[PDB]
């Protein structure tokens, strides 16, 4: 499942897809759910297989990508993109020394996500 | 319990929530000095909370209800 | 100053406080487990045998890290999530990781396994208590056929346990093990000669029928009875144990003239290096199996014991055979190299 | 040759003997191999390897405790060991190990005070290693900022 | 000699049959010394009463089957081994059991006899299937000690032995099970010190607390030969 | 003096330790005979023979 | 402090100047005799902060009483030594 | 010695050099727990120099692994010996043969899980007979350095120290030969001069209360590492040429 | 690392058809064990379609599995992690039982980590383990003849062979699966026939 | 209860060290019951006298070497552990040993104190090489039981630490070896009746007869606690 994380897209929707951007499957499904209800330009998709090493570097957390491997390259590509890591994964939270978003921490972490809705 | 905590998992369900609820209750006895419902029997605050959960006296919902009650009594006193 | 009152206070703090034990390498989550500590005089950490499997712990000098969970939350996560008792099954397969081995296996095997007649063949007892008293009195062997009346407790459609009493042929030894066996389990569980493979199933069965606390108690009981009977028996490893088959030299000279004939046919012209390599490896691989199976027939049984009158065949109580068959330690593969033929060895390339 | 030598000693050719349990006095139910093995005491004495640490000195840059018994060091809690706590639930045990037990300078003293006060509360902070990491990346000329809530 | 005597601490009586006895403090090695010595006397030397001989009318040997009776004679004899009996005066008593009709024959169907006391009158002996079936037997209870089987009785006594007298194992010893556990008694100063946990289990004819007293008494009677 | 576990031999395939044990006992067997003859003084001729 | 996310981006020349508390002009580390930081060197106290807690270099201001008091003579802020890990 | 050997035992013990071997042979004139003097036989004895060989034995010395190196005399007073005979045994050598450990009566059988995975069950008799008892010889140094504030002193005069501790140190501040010591006992007393020690209000009130100002000096004494315990066999002092020698030196 | 149980039930019908691993005569891995502790998908009843035997979203317990064996079900669509619809994690139902606990997985459990550890461990353990412990190699290459253990009729699926002058069926397919069918018509033994094979029948 | 008591029959004294003791008649099973119970007390609990402290003049520690002496101090101490001593009255006696000249220093060179008896006067302690060499030491013999090592005794009292006392291991247990054999006592009627043959092997001090009496006394003392308190 983690191998089949990403998917390439054909055509545009109401977002910035156009020809052959590689975006994660969950996020394009989210778009497709709101698109199907509202309409807008429909987007053909195709799931891509990533073998482990590249799949881990293709994660949209650059703190996880850096900690894994290829740190110099990961930080230049993130620095140039002005990438913003909102700290969703486990490795990210372990690095900043915080509660893991899992096990005991899942209760507390879901309470923080709802604190984002108000206050 | 003493040996194993399976019975207390069977009361609440989620091992993770068992730990939060036992933690919250043990903190009350640790700090507030809240009196234990079961005889202490030289048991640490960690085990007493698990006994209370096993027998079904302590629970997230019950703890919340009594927090509101003590908190409203204090509101009454301040006003 | 290590004052005497300090020891008493330290004893009071450690009570009900879990400690994490860790072994390198931590391959899977059971490489960390929580225990309730027991203060001991001496500089070595004492580890429970049954968890040695998860740590891959063997006591020829391995070391372990100790860690103290400080917060109430961390104590609770250790007692509920990471405790030894609560991590019985592995995260990979559904099979249990905590199970008796070595002595605990050897003892229960010695108890259950049957011998011909022995002291008090074909006797009638009234439950396992009479059997035990007989064995302790020294009028019955642990491996002797005896009719007993055991009362097994089988679960019904609800939570109620049904009781059933019946006469079943068994050894004295297995009857006495029934005493450890909790009510709910069938007597057929102890009625076979028990090995490590059967005892693992026994504890899994007990866990899924009865539940956690009963299996915890049952596991401890199995360990105590196993070690206590392990020292009561007296198994040893003599040089005469590994009995070599009489017919090794024949099998080998046959195999050896055969491979010789193919090497001579190599200069003639029917053979590449790969073809002859395959053919020689096949000849020796079959020879090795032959000598191994000769050793294992000659060793596994080849017990001439005179039953109550005439001669009989039964399983050998040769020490190494018992070790292998019980699954206690060596496999048939190791005992091939001891008593049979060592076989074809493989180079670092993997080519043989 | 060995069995012939045993016969010269009036010892059994099997080299197995009848043994009695010292505790019970009863005999062991089968003969046991007994003899003399030359044994060696290796340099690895428990006296030397035994070590324990509650709190001690701390490293210069990373602020984590030192390693090794000679430096009175805390045991290394490695990636491998962290993953075990991740597989479990154990999120507080892990944070402990990351923060008040290692770098978190304010946190470790504060929690020491709480444990003598018997509060058994964590009050976590920010591991000093991460503050270093930030400074090391800004020294490369990469702007790495913490964006607030 | 800095002699260090134990004292009987806790007597958990789980039941009249089963009773656990913790004992401390014991010096190192005395846990097994006293533990085993007592175990041996309590099994093979505790004196008591038990069925030795059984003569059933219309039964020539123990391998036959009597019609109207579910259990073969062997199984009936095995139930009589479990029959708990006290003789007050005599060393040997022959009790008579005559009963008929459909039902579980119990130990209460035995004709009382003044001095003899049957501890478990509800003890099952025989199940009668047909109502026309009647069972009659003369059960001999002797007093002895330890465990004397029929195999060890035929090898020693070869005097009067006519066919029909059914010999059954006679578990004189009132103690059914005994095991002792040595646990560490962390003592004021000594960690070497231990406790002895004796888990006893009789039938109810003799009290465990009194049986232990008795076993130690026999042990001290053997030490009278060695002066002090 | 020492009680070693049988199950750490057939798995290990070091059978040397068992042969060492048998010979070690035989060696000590002959030492025990000489110890007995030296305790009873006896003859230098007889010790020489054995 | 408690934050939501982290971002990474190219440092502007002027961004780099923001973090800086002075330009290190000289390779001088410390004085061989008084092992204290040299003028505008790599360990300059005038730039990175005081060597000892709440104490200037020339030693005119001491104790926790003096807080953020930049000594006029040597040019060293009286704050904690911790600052030299952050500035 | 090893009861079950191979024969390489003697070769290894001799060639290692740890045994004293006789070059010349002859008869032993004088044995001692320190030295062996042999009077050489006339046939190998050269007519030039006096024909008496002296082998000094090395007594209980430290190894690199802090094990013990001790040579004991093999031969008795007035024993005839040939060239290449072992005169004194090294540390792990019996009469000429190599002796790495101790042979024992061993029985192969389980105990009550006390030999679970290779775990070993030993008799108390082994401990009593002091077989596998071993002595370690670790060397500890105390260095008196010169700092920007001033030279460090090795005096017995150490601020804030019990008389229990200073009992074991002699005039100079050095522990006595033969003295048994345990963790935290001071072996060589040393003090690090402190310049303008700016104490706080809590320390200034403390120093005022006991009045033990104890000069401008710290405590950097060499003390026995925690938990290690043994007997002082030897002390060595290395001084610079110019500085006035300690009484004990 | 990121994969965590997020939802209890995504409410998906989708899953992968699991059949019994019956390779090399003796069944290697039974279907019961393969679908022991998984959330059953699609009301799968008995042969005669006129009454439901097993429900939909239901934890396959040892009891359900024992029923499956009396009816001898071969193929079962079960809900899997791969086909779960949950965005940013997976549902307790698609996963199934926490094999370490012996009941349904708890929401919040870090599943990915356990997966990686459990795949990784055996490799790392089997490296040191078989290697210090064994010396020689005890392989057995005699893959000449298929001999069938129990009587039955030969079933050849995926096969294209030519008849040779001997009278014999010489196979020229690459993928060839000889099976042993009984009476009722179930598959019980399998046997990979190679290329260049002589078939007896 | 037809109680059947044994009585001490035959005492073969093969030597002052080795002595065999037959015991009859014993009822069936009491052979092993008494046999092992006695063996355990006789090994672990037996009281005796042994060298605790040794102070040699001109010797600060046990690792040094004295000139004119072949043996290092450790080897001398190990020989004094093997010194067989009986104290009659007192629990603690300090014996003085002063000897000079060439010869094997034996146990007889110790000043024979009135109550104290040295069992083996020919026991070797020291070999003096040079004639000018003299050795002088004060050997303290204490009474105790079991085996009390110098290491267990260097972590207890230690109220006074005189730089010059050497602690040596003391084997207060006089019993070196013990085994019991159950043989059949073909009794008048009973063939299950048996005899107990206890083969004892002590060093000096304790008399075999006296030691068996003491061991049976200790066991009977411990039974008073169970016969008495319920
Ligand atoms: N270089 C090593 C050596 C050992 N180990 C771990 O420690 C275990 C035990 O090592 P060892 O005791 O040498 O192997 P055993 O299989 O126990 O065999 P034995 O002790 O009988 O030699 C190994 O299997 C492995 O998990 C390791 O990780 N790396
Ligand atoms: C040599 C070695 C050992 N070990 C572990 C495995 C068992 C113990 C003892 O090792 P030894 O007996 O080599 O340490 C390791 O984990 N890695 C290693 O390289
Ligand atoms: Mg190991
Ligand atoms: Zn200034």
From Swiss-Prot, chain A:
It comes from the Bacteria. The gene is rpoC. The chain holds residues 1258 to 1376 of 1407 of the full protein. The RNAP catalytic core consists of 2 alpha, 1 beta, 1 beta' and 1 omega subunit. When a sigma factor is associated with the core the holoenzyme is formed, which can initiate transcription. The rRNA transcription and antitermination complex (rrnTAC) consists of RNAP, NusA, NusB, NusE (rpsJ), NusG, SubB, ribosomal protein S4, DNA and precursor rRNA; S4 is more flexible than other subunits. It comes from Escherichia coli (strain K12). Co-administration of salinamide and rifampicin or salinamide and myxopyronin suppresses the emergence of resistance to both antibiotics. DNA-dependent RNA polymerase (RNAP) catalyzes the transcription of DNA into RNA using the four ribonucleoside triphosphates as substrates. This is DNA-directed RNA polymerase subunit beta'. Belongs to the RNA polymerase beta' chain family. Acetylated on several lysine residues in the presence of glucose.
Curated annotation (Swiss-Prot), chain B:
Its EC number is 2.7.7.6. One of its GO terms (molecular function) is DNA binding. One of its GO terms (cellular component) is cytosol. Keywords: DNA-directed RNA polymerase, Nucleotidyltransferase, Transcription, Transferase. GO terms for biological process: bacterial-type flagellum assembly; bacterial-type flagellum-dependent cell motility; cell motility; cellular response to cell envelope stress; DNA-templated transcription initiation; intracellular iron ion homeostasis; nitrate assimilation; protein-containing complex assembly. Belongs to the RNA polymerase subunit omega family. Promotes RNA polymerase (RNAP) assembly. Latches the N- and C-terminal regions of the beta' subunit thereby facilitating its interaction with the beta and alpha subunits. The RNAP catalytic core consists of 2 alpha, 1 beta, 1 beta' and 1 omega subunit. When a sigma factor is associated with the core the holoenzyme is formed, which can initiate transcription. The rRNA transcription and antitermination complex (rrnTAC) consists of RNAP, NusA, NusB, NusE (rpsJ), NusG, SubB, ribosomal protein S4, DNA and precursor rRNA; S4 is more flexible than other subunits. This is DNA-directed RNA polymerase subunit omega. It comes from Escherichia coli (strain K12). The lineage of its organism: Bacteria, Pseudomonadati, Pseudomonadota, Gammaproteobacteria, Enterobacterales. The gene is rpoZ.
UniProtKB/Swiss-Prot annotation, chain D:
It comes from the Bacteria. The modification N6-acetyllysine is found at residue 7. Transmembrane segments: none annotated. The RNAP catalytic core consists of 2 alpha, 1 beta, 1 beta' and 1 omega subunit. When a sigma factor is associated with the core the holoenzyme is formed, which can initiate transcription. Belongs to the RNA polymerase beta chain family. DNA-dependent RNA polymerase catalyzes the transcription of DNA into RNA using the four ribonucleoside triphosphates as substrates. This is DNA-directed RNA polymerase subunit beta. The chain holds residues 1194 to 1342 of 1342 of the full protein.
From Swiss-Prot, chain I:
This is DNA-directed RNA polymerase subunit beta'. It comes from the Bacteria. The chain holds residues 805 to 1005 of 1407 of the full protein. Disulfide bonds: none annotated. Zn(2+) 2 binds at residues 10, 84, 91, 94. The RNAP catalytic core consists of 2 alpha, 1 beta, 1 beta' and 1 omega subunit. When a sigma factor is associated with the core the holoenzyme is formed, which can initiate transcription. The rRNA transcription and antitermination complex (rrnTAC) consists of RNAP, NusA, NusB, NusE (rpsJ), NusG, SubB, ribosomal protein S4, DNA and precursor rRNA; S4 is more flexible than other subunits. Belongs to the RNA polymerase beta' chain family. Co-administration of salinamide and rifampicin or salinamide and myxopyronin suppresses the emergence of resistance to both antibiotics. DNA-dependent RNA polymerase (RNAP) catalyzes the transcription of DNA into RNA using the four ribonucleoside triphosphates as substrates. Acetylated on several lysine residues in the presence of glucose. The modification N6-acetyllysine is found at residue 179.
